[PDB]
Amino acid sequence: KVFGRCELAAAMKRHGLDNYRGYSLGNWVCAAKFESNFNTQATNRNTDGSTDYGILQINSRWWCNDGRTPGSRNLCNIPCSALLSSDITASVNCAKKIVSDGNGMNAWVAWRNRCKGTDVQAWIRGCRL
Ligand SMILES: [Cl-]
Ligand SMILES: [Cl-]
Ligand SMILES: [Cl-]
Ligand SMILES: [Cl-]
Ligand SMILES: [Cl-]
Ligand SMILES: [Cl-]
Ligand SMILES: [Cl-]
Ligand SMILES: [Cl-]
Ligand code: NA
């Protein structure tokens, strides 16, 4: 599923991501924009052999099981395929664990490089939330 901007904002808010760990909704929408262009089915292979899955490009090195990432963990206790669903629940629940891991949203390199410090409220501007 490819979400609309406000549609995704609303779904993220519904699932309790707005201001989660102090990160406003715009931060989450911005991260999703640059990780996946709002496409839940996005996948990308990393140089280390791990794969990133879903709207927030959650990595199989630590967070989900895909059966083909040697020496990895599955700290969200989910198959990586669950992160590709039209229903963002699994991605949101896992993102909550990731953002709580110590480095906040810096866990998402694209958030650090493209969202951090910017006017992230632009991402939810105009949305009925
Ligand atoms: Cl957009
Ligand atoms: Cl915001
Ligand atoms: Cl594996
Ligand atoms: Cl394969
Ligand atoms: Cl594990
Ligand atoms: Cl599994
Ligand atoms: Cl949803
Ligand atoms: Cl933080
Ligand atoms: Na894994």
Swiss-Prot record:
Disulfide bridge partners, by residue number: 6-127, 30-115, 64-80, 76-94
UniProt keyword list: Allergen, Antimicrobial, Bacteriolytic enzyme, Disulfide bond, Glycosidase, Hydrolase, Secreted, Signal
GO BP term (any one): defense response to bacterium
Expression tissues: In the egg white and polymorphonuclear leukocytes.
Subcellular location: Secreted
Quaternary state and interactors: Monomer.
Protein name, UniProt field: Lysozyme C
Encoding gene per record: LYZ
